[PDB]
Amino acid sequence: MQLNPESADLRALAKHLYDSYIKSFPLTKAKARAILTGKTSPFVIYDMNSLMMGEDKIKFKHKEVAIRIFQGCQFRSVEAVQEITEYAKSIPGFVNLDLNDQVTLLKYGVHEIIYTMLASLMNKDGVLISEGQGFMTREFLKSLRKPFGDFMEPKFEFAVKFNALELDDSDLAIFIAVIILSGDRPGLLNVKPIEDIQDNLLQALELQLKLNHPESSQLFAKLLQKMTDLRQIVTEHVQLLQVIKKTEMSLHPLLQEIYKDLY
């Protein structure tokens, strides 16, 4: 690499995305990791008893336990779509795209971003819930009645391998922008303007990674592969949502909208 006006713009892009990311997402990976390691204290949900006690202790913003959990994830999920929408709008050039492509991008992109960021809140033992007020265990989740015990496990599997990459918020800010700016979403009007934004974002990501991670040369290439993996996770998940919606089925109507064309 070289220091030129082009690289300097790539760094300013990265700073700008990082600053928006801090504005849009109140629970950052930095914050989540400090909660997780204990240097900063969440109520842990590890069994049916602690689940009930935690519902008492945790002031939630938003009837059988697996359904209650499903609803919590649905409301968390719609809150995430608002945050991700606010962030997308800060991606330079995004608001100048046709409003229809903006929504198409967000529609096909939000779950990939959701699972990416979910990894930030996970370790091998569990996941942060309710802005870090609670911690729900991987095995408590695996123990929920068929078929709810299989929803979260692939997210945990993805997350332990993803978290071993040791990305930080600065890396993630650009990673997430690349994902939002995918010119290959169905029903896109003007693909070329999107592809131009992404190639630039991609340059900014590759520079950021080289600078921020001297211990690995393979990181950019592994990240590209992670984006493909995320599409599988969303795919696997919507199907699991199909072969379950045949037994209950309150699905949030905003989520219903997003899922229908994902189906």
Ligand X SMILES: Cc1oc(-c2ccccc2)nc1CCOc1cccc(Cc2nn(-c3ccccc3)nc2CC(=O)O)c1
Q: What angle do CA 183, 235, 113 make, to 5 degrees?
A: 55
Among 24-32, 74-82, 93-101, 188-196, the segment contacting ligand X (CB under 6 A): 74-82
Residues 18-57 binding ligand X (CB under 6 A) are: none
Q: How far is CA 224 from the centre of its chain?
A: 15
Residue with smaller CB distance to ligand X, 97 or 241: 241
Contact partners, residue 214, CB within 8 Å, separation at least 6: none
Beta-bridge partners for 134: 43, 129
Closest of 217, 233, 262, 102 to residue 157, by C-alpha: 233
**Directed axis angle between helix 5-24 and helix 191-212, to 10°?**
90
Residue with smaller CB distance to ligand X, 145 or 192: 145
Q: How far is CA 88 from the centre of its chain?
A: 13
Residues 107-126 binding ligand X (CB under 6 A) are: 114, 118
Choose which of 135, 140, 148, 162 interacts with ligand X (CB under 6 A). Answer: 148
User: 11 by DSSP, 3-state: which?
Assistant: helix
Choose which of 21, 70, 108, 162 interacts with ligand X (CB under 6 A). Answer: 70
Does residue 7 bind ligand X (CB under 6 A)?
no
Torsion of CA 240, 244, 249, 250, to 10 degrees: -20
User: Does 259 count as an annotated binding residue?
Assistant: yes
Choose which of 7, 28, 74, 137 interacts with ligand X (CB under 6 A). Answer: 74
Q: 145, 73 in Cβ contact below 8 A? A: no
User: Does 237 count as an annotated binding residue?
Assistant: yes
Residue with smaller CB distance to ligand X, 176 or 204: 176
Residue with smaller CB distance to ligand X, 10 or 45: 45
Residue 50 backbone dihedrals phi, psi, to 5 degrees: -75, -25
Closest separation between CB of residue 109 and ligand X, Å?
Answer: 14
Q: 74, 237 in Cβ contact below 8 A? A: no
Which pair of structure tokens corresponds to residue 150?
Answer: 């299989």
Choose which of 32, 69, 219, 230 interacts with ligand X (CB under 6 A). Answer: 69
User: Does 68 count as an annotated binding residue?
Assistant: no
User: Does 252 count as an annotated binding residue?
Assistant: no
Please, what sign has the CA dihedral across residues 151, 143, 64, 50? Answer: negative
- In this chain, which residue has its C-beta nearest to ligand X? 72
Among 13-21, 69-77, 158-166, 186-194, the segment contacting ligand X (CB under 6 A): 69-77
Residues 230-259 binding ligand X (CB under 6 A) are: 241, 255
Question: Annotated binding site for rosiglitazone, which residues?
Answer: 74-77, 111, 237, 259
Positions touching ligand X (CB under 6 A) are 60, 66, 69-70, 72-74, 76-77, 114, 118, 127, 129-130, 136, 141, 144, 148, 151-152, 241, 255
